[PDB]
Design a protein around this nucleic acid. Structure first.
Length: 1073
RNA sequence: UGUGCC
């Protein structure tokens, strides 16, 4: 509960010249006392009197009531920051070395020198894009510094290392003064022109980096990145994190974890000697020298010191550095610059064509319905993103403009303009609008934003390909319900003294111009073969349309802005934006890896243990009929690079016998590592999310980084959360939500009271608050109801429905209309109205909690009912599993050591149900987990009607409605739904093997009735409680359950009526992946 | 409506 105490100190620190606590209680009499206390405090403050007497008088309110919020009556002028900053600003300011970046505008010049006229100015290249101010970040660091000013021992060293660092930030910022932000947390030209262009972004990155400093090594790393970053803005991250690929090959393997037949992690005590050719060492040295040429000193030395022995025990430092560089911010070039960079492929093209044919061969011959009604499927699937051009649209009687894809389709249909049979051009006549994706370290890549004709003409086929991939292991990113651990396991498996791994990053090749010809032709050739396999008119048109999109792309043109103008240039390369983007790319890399491997063998004779393609990378494990030597590696590597070289492909191929390093993960010393480079105080782009959503997201980013090996002080995160989640009443009245409001599992939850432990209200007050918050979950929007009543809109819903189902409409119909009413949420005007409504409702709720008829049950209610029926008792679980994921914090790591981990994801969509499968066979419709959950619990007769209404044949529908499988499905649908409400596949839990035998013994549950749903919830609740206790106390306990027989029947009724809560915390988990 | 595909 330290969050509440912390908030007062921070507020007291920020303002000085009052704070009014606000409590509430589920007990009528106590609440009145809370009302009396609030009135007295306002009255006393209004008269400038002390509140000390009142606190003693209302001792009971402080002691038992639950704090809801804090009132901030501050009469200053959001200043203080200028005054506060100066004491810390003494050291010498930093000077921008305007000679380190190629492209001029990437140097820390004076804003004016970049944009002389306020009309030439643009933040397009430095916009933090986050909804929190630079001034607030600075305020947070200073506040933390003051609190930890009088600390001792090791704590002091952390303060001192941090204090030194912020000195550079403070002094440099002062030389120009703190920049001021507008209403939308943006930095305009007037504040900007006197100050160095990249000043605001740089300060944010350094502050974020410093508040994540603890050990001396952290201090050394943060300082080099900070000073260097201010000058360098385009290669520092890349230079710092490049030696990592070379490093993995060096470390030896002493006991690793592999994959077994049951596809689960199993420990192997083997030893694999690292074999590295002298040439590789020269390459690493060149990389180190390059870091040095760029002013780097401390970082290069650390890598060099490590190299003397390359002990996997002193390797965490290398890992720490790799995670660290990403925190220098994003590299945002000029669209044109990002855009500008851009006879033997016969074997390569053929494989791509063959792979495409396999993925649809069976679907095409049979005459799959999805292929037949592909157009309908695209419409249901259709998103609410952009279509490319801002159009004027009329809805009922309102004339407004939108760019949204959904809006364009509805307007077009109501004008006989809807024509998916005609796939628009993307050449010189109708150039493609561009989209951009920015990431730290790597170069900016462009994105096509093609007309919805393209999404529709490709949605059905890509879905078919994904299903094929779903069961093909070569495609690591799509295989089964696998996670990254299984992939990690597969590489280690066949590792021995007569086998070498081959990893390759082909990010450059994917964009190449050489690539697009062979790529498009291969897909097209495949499409022609598939067409020569059926006679179905519906299938051919859908198949034919897909072919057309590939042809139009072959010769494309792009609209790249060059200032304020839009130059139309010829883009002869493959860019992402299509539907088949990921699936096609995966096919292309796999075809490519296969092509290189085949050419090499003519020379060498090996065995292919495994081949894989995962994202922009691809790798393989080969086996030779002899012991691998340093000389052998050089020969295999030179030939492989040469094979890539002949195909004019620019890639980075490496050969090792112990580890590999790709974009998503890296393996060194038999251990699995994952980069932890998520930016905190700077984003990639702006969206339509609120401050609360962003605050929830920041906490999430912090949790993933903390899990991955990059920790940022929690107090700083908490401090950031307090500033972000605040709400102003006036220009001097600001309301700060309490910890209970912030952390309770409600529609307004932002973070967990205690990291790695999701709590649920076990007290009456929490329950009272939870019920109240839900009360005001959804808010109305006029602009939204308007269009929801217009003609064109209802017709669009009606046209989709009369095309989909046969019999009656409503469980399906209500969903389609709503699913379509929400898509309007991309339209800012509607988004803005919703937020304003939420705040006003929120201000009143914090002020004085309202009443609620409840009548709605949730997950928290089910858990609360169970709790009082378990008996706790100290138990003990020894550690049996060696550590394979080192970066993991100690408390999280301990649970894995004692009970183990898993290599799969727990099905939380119900897709593995027989009924869901049956719907898939005859319908293009895709029910949600929630819809399936409501549907399964319906009267046998009702279910039969619903299946028929969707097109399911009578003999099939009738057979299911009474079978054994339907009964089993009932339990399965609920199990999937319950896991979903408990986020078992997210955060820290996704790691633990909840089916662990060791975990299982700690649970004692005697059957007293026997009813699937009831048994599942008790075991799950017990498993979560035992694990959570373990996370907090580092020790274990055993659980006994004596739940009544009468009680279970009541509980079961409760279970089939659970509602789902929507909250920023929930959104953030969805947001991560 | 400072707007940006899968």
């Amino acid at each position: 509960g330290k969050y509440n105490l912390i908030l007062s100190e921070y507020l007291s620190f920020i303002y000085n010249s009052v704070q009014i606590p606000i409590y509430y209680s589920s007990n009528s009499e106590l609440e009145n006392r809370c009302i009396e206390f609030h009135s007295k405090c306002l009255e006393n403050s209004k008269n400038g009197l002390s509140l000390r007497k009142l606190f003693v008088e209302y001792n009971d309110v402080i002691e038992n009531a639950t704090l809801l919020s804090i009132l901030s009556y501050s009469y200053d002028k959001y200043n203080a920051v200028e005054r506060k900053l100066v004491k810390y600003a003494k050291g010498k300011p930093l000077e921008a070395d305007l000679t380190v970046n190629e492209l001029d505008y990437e140097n820390n010049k004076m804003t004016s020198e970049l944009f002389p006229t306020a009309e030439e100015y643009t933040d397009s290249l430095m916009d933090p894009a986050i909804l929190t101010s630079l001034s607030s970040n600075l305020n947070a660091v200073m506040f933390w510094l003051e609190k930890h000013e009088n600390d001792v021992a090791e704590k002091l060293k952390v303060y001192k290392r941090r204090l030194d660092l912020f000195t550079i930030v403070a002094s440099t910022i002062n030389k120009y003064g703190v920049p001021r932000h507008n209403a939308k947390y943006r930095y305009e030209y007037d504040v900007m022109k006197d100050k160095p262009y990249y000043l605001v972004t740089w300060a944010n990155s350094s502050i974020e980096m410093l508040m994540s400093v603890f050990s001396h090594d952290d201090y050394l790393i943060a300082k080099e990145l900070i000073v260097l970053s201010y000058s360098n803005r385009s290669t520092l991250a890349k230079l710092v994190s490049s030696p990592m690929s070379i490093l993995v090959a060096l470390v030896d393997i002493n006991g690793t974890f592999i994959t077994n037949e049951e596809l689960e992690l199993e420990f192997s005590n083997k030893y694999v000697r690292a074999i590295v050719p002298d040439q590789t060492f020269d390459e690493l040295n060149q990389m180190l020298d390059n870091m040095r040429k760029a002013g780097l000193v401390d970082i290069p030395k650390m890598i060099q010191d490590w190299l003397v022995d390359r002990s996997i025990e002193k390797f965490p430092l290398m890992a720490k550095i790799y995670s660290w560089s990403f925190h220098v911010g994003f590299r945002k070039q000029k669209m044109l610059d990002a855009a500008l960079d851009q006879e033997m492929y016969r074997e390569y093209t053929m494989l791509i064509r063959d792979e495409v044919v396999k993925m649809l061969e069976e679907p095409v011959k049979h005459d799959d319905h999805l292929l037949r009604d592909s157009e309908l499927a695209g419409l249901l699937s259709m998103s609410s993103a952009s279509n490319g051009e801002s159009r004027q649209l009329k809805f009922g009687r309102k004339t407004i403009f939108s760019t949204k894809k959904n809006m364009h389709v509805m307007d077009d249909m109501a004008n006989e303009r809807y024509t998916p049979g005609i796939i628009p051009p993307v050449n010189v006549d109708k150039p493609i609008p561009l989209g951009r994706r920015d990431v730290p370290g790597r170069r900016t890549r462009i994105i096509f934003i093609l007309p919805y004709e393209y999404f529709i003409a490709q949605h059905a086929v890509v879905e078919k390909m994904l299903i094929y991939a779903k069961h093909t292991r070569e495609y690591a990113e799509f295989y089964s319900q696998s996670n990254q651990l299984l992939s990690y396991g597969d590489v280690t498996r066949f590792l021995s003294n007569n086998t070498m791994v081959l990893y390759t990053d082909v990010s450059q090749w994917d964009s190449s111009q050489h690539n697009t010809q062979p790529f498009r032709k291969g897909i097209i050739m495949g499409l022609d073969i598939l067409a020569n396999m059926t006679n179905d008119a519906k299938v051919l048109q859908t198949l034919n349309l897909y072919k057309q999109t590939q042809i139009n792309l072959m010769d494309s043109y792009v609209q790249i802005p060059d200032g304020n103008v839009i130059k139309k240039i010829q883009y002869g390369a493959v860019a992402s934006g299509e539907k088949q983007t990921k699936a096609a790319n995966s096919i292309a890399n796999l075809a490519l890896i296969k092509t290189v491997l085949s050419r090499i063998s003519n020379k060498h004779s090996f065995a292919t243990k495994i081949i894989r393609v995962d994202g922009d990378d691809n790798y393989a494990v080969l086996q030779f009929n002899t012991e691998v030597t340093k000389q052998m590696i050089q020969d295999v590597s030179n030939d492989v690079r040469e094979t890539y070289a002949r195909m004019n492909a620019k890639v980075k191929a490496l050969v090792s016998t112990v580890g590999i390093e790709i974009a998503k993960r890296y393996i060194a010393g038999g251990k699995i590592f994952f980069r932890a480079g998520i930016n905190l105080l700077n984003n990639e782009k702006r969206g339509q999310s609120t401050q609360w959503d962003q605050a929830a997201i920041l906490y999430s980013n912090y949790i993933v980084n903390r899990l991955r090996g990059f920790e940022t002080d929690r107090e700083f995160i908490l401090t950031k959360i307090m500033q972000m989640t605040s709400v102003a009443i006036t220009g001097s009245l600001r309301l700060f939500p309490s910890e209970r409001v912030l952390t309770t599992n409600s529609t307004f939850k932002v973070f967990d009271s205690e990291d790695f432990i999701i709590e649920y209200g076990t007290t009456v007050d929490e329950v009272y608050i939870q019920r109240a918050f839900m009360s005001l979950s959804s808010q109305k929007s006029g602009i939204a109801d308007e269009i929801a009543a217009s003609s064109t809109f209802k017709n669009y819903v009606t046209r989709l429905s009369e095309q989909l189902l046969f019999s009656k409409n409503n469980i399906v119909s209500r969903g389609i209309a709503l699913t379509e009413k929400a898509k309007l949420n991309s339209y800012a005007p509607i988004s803005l109205e919703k937020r304003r409504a939420q705040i006003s409702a929120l201000l009143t709720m914090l002020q004085k909690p309202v009443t609620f008829k409840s009548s709605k049950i949730t997950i928290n209610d089910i858990l609360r009912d169970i709790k009082p029926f378990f008996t706790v008792s100290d138990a003990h679980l020894p550690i049996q599993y060696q550590k394979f994921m080192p970066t993991l914090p100690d408390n999280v790591q301990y649970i894995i050591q004692c009970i183990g981990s898993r290599t799969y994801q727990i099905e939380d969509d119900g897709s593995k149900s027989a009924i869901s499968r049956l719907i898939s066979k005859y319908s293009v419709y895709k029910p949600s987990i929630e819809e399936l959950y409501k549907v399964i619990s319906l009267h046998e007769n009702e279910i039969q009607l619903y299946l028929i209404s969707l097109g399911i044949p009578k003999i099939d529908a009738d057979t299911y409605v009474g079978s054994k499988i339907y009964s089993r499905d009932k339990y399965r649908i609920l199990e999937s739904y319950v896991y979903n409400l408990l986020s078992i596949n997210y955060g820290c839990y996704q790691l633990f093997d909840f089916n662990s035998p060791d975990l299982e013994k700690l649970i004692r549950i005697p059957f007293k009735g026997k009813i699937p749903a009831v048994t599942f919830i008790l075991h799950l609740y017990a498993k979560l409680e035992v694990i959570n206790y373990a996370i907090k106390n580092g020790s274990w306990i055993s659980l006994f359950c004596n739940y009544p027989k009468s009680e279970m029947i009541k509980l079961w009724k409760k279970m089939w009526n659970i509602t789902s809560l929507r909250s920023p915390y929930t959104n953030a988990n969805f947001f991560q992946e």
